Coordinates of C-alpha atoms in Angstrom, one line a residue:
Chain A
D1 CA 2.3 -33.6 4.6
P2 CA 3.9 -34.0 8.1
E3 CA 7.2 -35.3 6.5
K4 CA 7.7 -32.0 4.6
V5 CA 7.0 -29.8 7.6
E6 CA 9.5 -31.8 9.7
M7 CA 12.2 -31.4 7.0
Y8 CA 11.7 -27.7 6.8
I9 CA 11.8 -27.7 10.6
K10 CA 15.3 -29.3 10.6
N11 CA 16.2 -27.0 7.6
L12 CA 15.8 -24.1 10.1
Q13 CA 19.2 -25.1 11.6
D14 CA 21.1 -25.5 8.2
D15 CA 24.3 -23.6 7.6
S16 CA 23.1 -22.1 4.4
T17 CA 21.5 -18.7 5.1
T18 CA 19.3 -19.4 2.1
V19 CA 18.1 -22.8 3.3
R20 CA 17.0 -21.2 6.6
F21 CA 14.9 -18.4 5.2
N22 CA 13.4 -20.6 2.4
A23 CA 12.4 -23.0 5.2
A24 CA 10.7 -20.3 7.3
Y25 CA 8.9 -19.2 4.2
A26 CA 7.6 -22.6 3.3
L27 CA 6.5 -23.3 6.9
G28 CA 4.7 -20.0 6.8
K29 CA 2.8 -21.2 3.6
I30 CA 2.0 -24.6 4.9
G31 CA 0.7 -23.0 8.1
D32 CA 1.3 -26.0 10.4
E33 CA 1.2 -25.2 14.2
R34 CA 4.2 -27.6 15.0
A35 CA 6.6 -25.1 13.4
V36 CA 5.7 -22.3 15.8
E37 CA 8.3 -23.0 18.4
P38 CA 11.1 -23.7 15.9
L39 CA 10.2 -20.4 14.2
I40 CA 10.1 -18.6 17.5
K41 CA 13.8 -19.7 17.6
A42 CA 14.6 -18.4 14.1
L43 CA 13.5 -14.9 15.3
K44 CA 17.1 -14.6 16.6
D45 CA 19.0 -15.9 13.6
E46 CA 22.2 -14.0 12.8
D47 CA 20.7 -13.1 9.4
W48 CA 17.9 -10.5 9.1
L49 CA 16.0 -12.1 6.2
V50 CA 15.8 -15.3 8.1
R51 CA 14.3 -13.3 11.1
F52 CA 12.1 -11.3 8.7
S53 CA 10.8 -14.6 7.3
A54 CA 10.3 -16.2 10.7
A55 CA 8.3 -13.3 11.9
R56 CA 6.2 -13.3 8.7
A57 CA 5.7 -17.0 8.9
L58 CA 4.4 -16.7 12.4
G59 CA 2.0 -13.9 11.4
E60 CA 0.6 -16.4 8.9
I61 CA 0.2 -19.5 11.2
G62 CA -1.6 -17.1 13.5
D63 CA -0.8 -19.0 16.8
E64 CA -1.2 -16.8 19.9
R65 CA 2.1 -18.3 21.3
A66 CA 4.1 -16.2 18.8
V67 CA 2.9 -13.0 20.4
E68 CA 5.5 -12.3 23.2
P69 CA 8.4 -13.3 21.0
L70 CA 7.0 -11.1 18.2
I71 CA 6.7 -8.2 20.7
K72 CA 10.5 -8.6 21.3
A73 CA 11.2 -8.7 17.5
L74 CA 9.6 -5.2 17.4
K75 CA 12.9 -3.9 18.9
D76 CA 15.2 -5.7 16.4
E77 CA 18.1 -3.6 15.2
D78 CA 16.9 -4.1 11.6
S79 CA 13.9 -2.0 10.5
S80 CA 12.7 -4.7 8.0
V81 CA 12.4 -7.2 10.9
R82 CA 10.5 -4.6 13.0
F83 CA 8.1 -4.0 10.1
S84 CA 7.6 -7.7 9.7
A85 CA 7.0 -8.1 13.4
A86 CA 4.4 -5.3 13.5
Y87 CA 2.7 -6.8 10.4
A88 CA 2.7 -10.3 12.0
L89 CA 1.1 -9.0 15.3
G90 CA -1.6 -6.9 13.6
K91 CA -2.5 -10.0 11.7
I92 CA -2.6 -12.2 14.9
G93 CA -4.8 -9.5 16.4
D94 CA -3.9 -10.1 20.1
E95 CA -4.5 -7.2 22.4
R96 CA -1.1 -7.7 24.1
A97 CA 0.5 -6.3 21.0
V98 CA -1.3 -2.9 21.7
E99 CA 1.1 -1.0 23.9
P100 CA 4.1 -2.3 22.2
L101 CA 2.6 -1.2 18.8
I102 CA 1.8 2.2 20.4
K103 CA 5.5 2.4 21.1
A104 CA 6.3 1.6 17.4
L105 CA 4.4 4.7 16.5
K106 CA 7.6 6.4 17.3
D107 CA 10.1 4.3 15.3
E108 CA 12.6 6.2 13.3
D109 CA 11.7 4.2 10.1
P110 CA 8.5 5.8 8.7
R111 CA 7.3 2.4 7.3
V112 CA 7.4 0.9 10.8
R113 CA 5.4 3.8 12.2
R114 CA 2.9 3.3 9.3
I115 CA 2.3 -0.4 9.7
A116 CA 2.2 0.0 13.5
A117 CA -0.7 2.5 12.9
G118 CA -2.3 -0.1 10.6
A119 CA -1.8 -3.0 13.1
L120 CA -3.5 -0.8 15.7
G121 CA -6.3 -0.1 13.4
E122 CA -6.9 -3.8 12.8
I123 CA -6.9 -4.6 16.5
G124 CA -9.5 -1.9 17.2
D125 CA -8.3 -1.3 20.8
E126 CA -9.5 2.2 21.9
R127 CA -6.1 2.7 23.8
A128 CA -4.6 3.4 20.3
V129 CA -6.8 6.5 20.0
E130 CA -4.8 9.3 21.6
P131 CA -1.4 8.0 20.3
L132 CA -2.9 7.8 16.7
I133 CA -4.1 11.3 17.2
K134 CA -0.5 12.3 17.9
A135 CA 0.5 10.5 14.7
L136 CA -1.7 12.8 12.6
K137 CA 1.2 15.2 13.2
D138 CA 3.9 13.0 11.9
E139 CA 6.5 14.6 9.6
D140 CA 5.7 11.8 7.1
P141 CA 2.5 12.1 5.0
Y142 CA 2.0 8.3 4.6
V143 CA 2.1 7.9 8.4
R144 CA -0.4 10.8 8.7
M145 CA -2.6 9.0 6.2
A146 CA -2.2 5.6 8.0
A147 CA -3.2 7.1 11.3
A148 CA -6.4 8.6 9.9
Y149 CA -7.3 5.4 8.2
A150 CA -6.8 3.6 11.6
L151 CA -8.9 6.2 13.5
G152 CA -11.8 5.9 11.0
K153 CA -11.7 2.2 11.3
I154 CA -11.6 2.3 15.1
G155 CA -14.6 4.8 15.0
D156 CA -13.9 6.6 18.3
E157 CA -15.6 10.1 18.5
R158 CA -12.5 11.7 19.9
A159 CA -10.9 11.4 16.5
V160 CA -13.4 13.8 15.0
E161 CA -12.0 17.3 15.5
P162 CA -8.4 16.1 14.9
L163 CA -9.6 14.6 11.6
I164 CA -11.4 17.9 10.7
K165 CA -8.1 19.7 11.1
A166 CA -6.5 17.0 8.9
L167 CA -8.8 18.2 6.1
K168 CA -6.5 21.2 6.1
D169 CA -3.3 19.2 5.5
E170 CA -0.8 20.2 2.8
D171 CA -0.8 16.7 1.4
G172 CA -3.7 15.4 -0.7
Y173 CA -3.4 11.9 0.6
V174 CA -4.0 12.8 4.2
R175 CA -6.9 15.1 3.2
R176 CA -8.4 12.2 1.3
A177 CA -7.9 9.9 4.3
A178 CA -9.3 12.3 6.8
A179 CA -12.4 12.7 4.7
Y180 CA -12.9 9.0 4.3
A181 CA -12.4 8.4 8.1
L182 CA -14.9 11.1 8.9
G183 CA -17.5 9.5 6.6
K184 CA -17.0 6.2 8.4
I185 CA -17.2 7.7 11.9
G186 CA -20.3 9.5 10.9
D187 CA -20.3 12.3 13.5
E188 CA -22.4 15.2 12.3
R189 CA -19.7 17.7 13.2
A190 CA -17.8 16.7 10.0
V191 CA -20.7 17.9 7.7
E192 CA -19.5 21.5 7.4
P193 CA -15.7 21.0 6.9
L194 CA -16.6 18.3 4.3
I195 CA -18.8 20.7 2.4
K196 CA -15.7 22.9 1.9
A197 CA -13.7 19.9 0.9
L198 CA -16.1 19.5 -2.0
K199 CA -14.3 22.5 -3.4
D200 CA -10.8 20.9 -3.1
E201 CA -8.1 21.2 -5.8
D202 CA -7.4 17.5 -5.5
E203 CA -10.2 15.6 -7.1
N204 CA -9.5 12.6 -4.9
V205 CA -10.4 14.8 -1.9
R206 CA -13.6 16.0 -3.5
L207 CA -14.6 12.4 -4.3
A208 CA -14.1 11.3 -0.7
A209 CA -15.8 14.3 0.8
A210 CA -18.9 13.6 -1.3
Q211 CA -18.8 9.9 -0.4
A212 CA -18.4 10.9 3.3
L213 CA -21.4 13.2 3.1
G214 CA -23.5 10.4 1.6
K215 CA -22.6 8.1 4.6
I216 CA -23.3 10.8 7.2
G217 CA -26.8 11.3 5.8
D218 CA -27.2 14.9 7.0
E219 CA -29.3 17.2 4.8
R220 CA -27.1 20.2 4.7
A221 CA -25.1 18.4 2.1
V222 CA -27.9 18.2 -0.6
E223 CA -27.4 21.5 -2.4
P224 CA -23.6 21.4 -2.1
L225 CA -23.9 17.9 -3.6
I226 CA -26.4 19.0 -6.3
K227 CA -23.7 21.4 -7.4
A228 CA -21.0 18.7 -7.4
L229 CA -23.1 17.0 -10.1
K230 CA -21.6 19.7 -12.4
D231 CA -18.1 18.6 -11.4
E232 CA -15.4 18.3 -14.2
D233 CA -14.3 15.0 -12.7
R234 CA -16.6 12.1 -13.7
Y235 CA -16.0 10.1 -10.5
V236 CA -16.8 13.1 -8.3
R237 CA -20.0 13.4 -10.2
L238 CA -21.2 9.8 -10.0
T239 CA -20.3 9.7 -6.3
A240 CA -22.2 12.9 -5.6
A241 CA -25.1 11.2 -7.3
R242 CA -24.6 8.1 -5.2
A243 CA -24.4 10.3 -2.0
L244 CA -27.8 12.0 -2.9
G245 CA -29.6 8.6 -3.0
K246 CA -28.1 7.6 0.3
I247 CA -29.6 10.7 1.9
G248 CA -33.2 10.0 0.9
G249 CA -36.1 12.1 1.9
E250 CA -38.3 14.7 0.1
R251 CA -36.0 17.7 0.4
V252 CA -33.7 15.9 -2.0
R253 CA -36.7 14.6 -3.9
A254 CA -37.7 18.3 -4.3
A255 CA -34.2 19.3 -5.5
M256 CA -34.6 16.4 -7.9
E257 CA -38.0 17.7 -9.1
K258 CA -36.7 21.2 -10.0
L259 CA -33.6 19.7 -11.5
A260 CA -35.6 17.5 -13.8
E261 CA -37.3 20.7 -15.0
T262 CA -34.5 23.2 -15.2
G263 CA -31.5 20.8 -15.6
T264 CA -29.2 19.6 -18.3
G265 CA -26.5 17.0 -18.8
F266 CA -25.7 14.2 -16.2
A267 CA -27.3 16.3 -13.5
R268 CA -30.7 16.2 -15.3
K269 CA -30.4 12.4 -15.9
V270 CA -29.9 11.5 -12.2
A271 CA -32.9 13.7 -11.4
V272 CA -35.3 11.9 -13.7
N273 CA -33.9 8.5 -12.7
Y274 CA -34.1 9.2 -9.0
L275 CA -37.7 10.4 -9.4
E276 CA -38.3 7.3 -11.5
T277 CA -37.2 5.4 -8.5
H278 CA -37.8 7.3 -5.2
Chain B
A1 CA 12.6 -12.9 -21.6
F2 CA 13.9 -11.9 -18.2
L3 CA 16.9 -9.4 -18.3
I4 CA 17.8 -6.0 -16.9
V5 CA 19.3 -2.9 -18.5
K6 CA 21.1 -0.1 -16.7
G7 CA 22.8 3.2 -17.8
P8 CA 24.3 -10.3 3.9
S9 CA 21.1 -12.2 3.1
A10 CA 20.6 -9.8 0.2
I11 CA 23.5 -11.6 -1.5
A12 CA 22.3 -15.1 -0.6
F13 CA 18.8 -14.0 -1.9
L14 CA 19.8 -12.5 -5.3
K15 CA 22.1 -15.6 -5.9
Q16 CA 19.0 -17.9 -6.4
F17 CA 18.4 -16.4 -9.9
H18 CA 27.2 -15.3 -8.0
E19 CA 29.5 -12.7 -9.4
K20 CA 26.8 -11.0 -11.6
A21 CA 24.5 -11.5 -8.6
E22 CA 26.7 -9.1 -6.7
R23 CA 26.9 -6.9 -9.8
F24 CA 23.2 -6.8 -10.3
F25 CA 23.0 -6.1 -6.6
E26 CA 25.1 -2.9 -6.8
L27 CA 22.4 -2.0 -9.4
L28 CA 19.7 -1.8 -6.7
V29 CA 22.1 0.1 -4.4
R30 CA 23.7 2.8 -6.6
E31 CA 20.5 4.5 -7.9
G32 CA 18.1 3.3 -5.2
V33 CA 14.9 3.8 -7.1
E34 CA 11.8 5.4 -5.5
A35 CA 9.4 3.8 -8.0
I36 CA 8.8 0.8 -10.1
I37 CA 6.5 1.0 -13.2
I38 CA 4.7 -2.1 -14.2
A39 CA 3.4 -2.2 -17.8
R40 CA 2.7 -4.5 -20.8
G41 CA 5.1 -2.9 -23.3
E42 CA 4.0 2.8 -25.4
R43 CA 1.7 5.7 -24.5
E44 CA 1.1 3.8 -21.3
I45 CA 4.8 4.3 -20.5
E46 CA 4.9 8.1 -21.2
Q47 CA 2.1 8.5 -18.7
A48 CA 3.6 6.4 -16.0
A49 CA 6.9 8.1 -16.4
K50 CA 5.6 11.6 -15.8
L51 CA 3.0 10.3 -13.5
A52 CA 6.0 9.0 -11.4
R53 CA 7.8 12.2 -12.2
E54 CA 4.9 14.1 -10.7
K55 CA 6.2 12.9 -7.3
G56 CA 9.8 13.5 -8.4
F57 CA 10.5 9.8 -8.2
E58 CA 13.7 8.4 -9.8
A59 CA 12.3 5.2 -11.2
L60 CA 12.7 1.7 -12.6
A61 CA 10.5 0.1 -15.2
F62 CA 9.2 -3.5 -15.5
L63 CA 7.2 -5.0 -18.5
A64 CA 6.5 -8.1 -20.5
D65 CA 15.9 -1.6 -29.6
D66 CA 13.0 0.6 -28.3
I67 CA 14.2 -0.3 -24.8
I68 CA 17.4 1.9 -25.2
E69 CA 15.4 5.1 -26.1
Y70 CA 13.4 4.8 -22.9
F71 CA 16.5 6.0 -21.1
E72 CA 16.8 9.4 -22.8
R73 CA 13.0 9.8 -23.2
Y74 CA 12.2 9.0 -19.5
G75 CA 15.3 9.1 -17.5
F76 CA 15.0 5.6 -16.0
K77 CA 17.8 4.3 -13.8
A78 CA 17.0 0.7 -15.1
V79 CA 14.6 -1.3 -17.2
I80 CA 13.6 -4.9 -16.6
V81 CA 12.0 -6.8 -19.4
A82 CA 10.1 -10.1 -19.6
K83 CA 16.9 -16.5 -27.7
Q84 CA 19.6 -14.6 -25.7
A85 CA 20.1 -11.5 -27.9
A86 CA 21.3 -9.4 -25.0
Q87 CA 24.8 -9.3 -26.5
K88 CA 23.6 -6.8 -29.1
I89 CA 22.6 -4.5 -26.2
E90 CA 25.8 -4.9 -24.1
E91 CA 27.8 -3.6 -27.1
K92 CA 25.7 -0.4 -27.6
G93 CA 26.8 0.8 -24.2
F94 CA 24.1 -0.6 -21.9
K95 CA 24.9 -3.3 -19.3
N96 CA 10.0 -23.2 -1.8
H97 CA 11.3 -19.7 -2.7
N98 CA 9.7 -16.1 -2.6
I99 CA 10.8 -14.1 -5.6
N100 CA 8.6 -11.3 -4.3
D101 CA 11.1 -10.5 -1.6
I102 CA 13.1 -8.5 -4.1
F103 CA 10.6 -5.8 -3.2
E104 CA 12.0 -5.8 0.4
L105 CA 15.5 -5.5 -1.1
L106 CA 14.5 -2.5 -3.2
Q107 CA 12.6 -1.0 -0.3
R108 CA 15.7 -1.0 2.0
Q109 CA 17.5 1.0 -0.8
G110 CA 14.6 3.4 -0.9
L111 CA 11.7 2.1 -3.0
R112 CA 8.5 3.9 -2.0
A113 CA 5.9 3.1 -4.7
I114 CA 4.7 0.9 -7.5
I115 CA 3.0 2.6 -10.4
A116 CA 0.6 0.4 -12.3
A117 CA 0.2 1.4 -16.0
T118 CA -2.9 0.9 -18.2
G119 CA -3.6 -2.4 -19.8
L120 CA -2.2 -4.7 -17.1
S121 CA -4.3 -7.7 -16.7
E122 CA -6.5 -8.0 -13.6
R123 CA -4.1 -10.8 -12.5
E124 CA -1.2 -8.4 -12.7
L125 CA -3.0 -5.5 -11.0
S126 CA -3.9 -7.6 -7.9
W127 CA -0.4 -9.0 -7.8
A128 CA 1.0 -5.5 -7.8
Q129 CA -1.5 -4.5 -5.2
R130 CA -0.8 -7.5 -3.0
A131 CA 2.9 -6.5 -3.0
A132 CA 2.1 -2.9 -2.0
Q133 CA 0.2 -4.3 0.9
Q134 CA 2.8 -6.9 2.0
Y135 CA 5.8 -4.7 1.6
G136 CA 4.2 -1.5 2.9
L137 CA 4.7 0.3 -0.5
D138 CA 2.5 2.8 -2.1
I139 CA 0.7 1.8 -5.3
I140 CA -0.5 4.4 -7.8
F141 CA -3.0 3.6 -10.6
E142 CA -12.5 3.9 -10.1
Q143 CA -13.5 3.8 -6.4
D144 CA -12.7 2.5 -2.9
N145 CA -10.2 -0.2 -4.1
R146 CA -7.9 2.3 -5.7
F147 CA -6.7 2.7 -2.0
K148 CA -7.4 -0.9 -0.9
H149 CA -3.7 -1.2 0.1
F150 CA -4.3 1.6 2.6
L151 CA -7.8 0.6 3.8
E152 CA -6.6 -3.0 4.4
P153 CA -3.0 -2.6 5.4
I154 CA -3.0 -6.0 6.9
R155 CA -3.9 -8.7 4.5

């Protein structure tokens, strides 16, 4: 409805703060390209929510023209606006956002650093790799987590040994994220540190370790995973069982044969069923 | 129902739902909650409270005179529930548009997580999870999608 877009467009210059940000929101939802340049202008409104909302709306229209102005909004005095700008750019996906996002890895607001790491992950540009490896050292656990998620998604081998060390983190969220990222990268050097992680206090860590070992598909995991079938946590158990099927072969078909014979409980059940299949 | 119990664009924003707007703004500032619980309405709540307490989070609760005992029993800084029998409560000693932006307001005063309690509809769970994504909040609840908001930080 062109008549509505235009009205919200003029609404961008209203005197009411509320009318300005509600107009930038609505334009964002309509998603019409004609609003891009007027929204580019709102990125400098005296009021932060208006700016926040202009940046968000541009993330949504997805027009590459918003990129340089959004790169500027990354330096906004207000941390909400910077968050909204980093989110908008990761969503547009334009490689020009890359070095500015890398700079936002050092913002004083820990949310900005976090969504910067995420935006980087979404773009997939290998230049983010070493800076994201720095961020595994961040004072903030969520930032450390975000960085490992972004590294797993990027898939660059250089992330591996820094991710291994993150399996040693004090926070169970980062440990969970490091294991997940290692499973996704699928480098065999993770196989041994993940086997340890199967004995973690946090059951979210054990779950991800097991899953990660299933993806990796290396055979040294079989017996450590047979054991995890006796795990107190139900989800750790089911996942260990999933992981065993993913690593096919006969070595596991032989662990499955003895287990059908000398096994009890869930562990016996997956043995017969696996054998029933293959 | 739709009322709170305790015991700048932020102003232009709150106004939409003007003197009590500023009052129920000082709400969000004073305590500055680190957590919002979302529930249906009672074992679900005892969990969520000490689940939130597990991270030492001073918290708010949202759900749709039991409501007054939640204060002593859980320590909440505020409850939000969802006629006009609020007057009974006030006596006892307890005081186009994007409504979801309240999350950004709370975040700036220190909000860090949502905690979803048992029995929320799927509709409600995805709405809470969408908000965690879009406002960069944590959300705490069988598999991968428990951490969807971290795996897919850009929606």
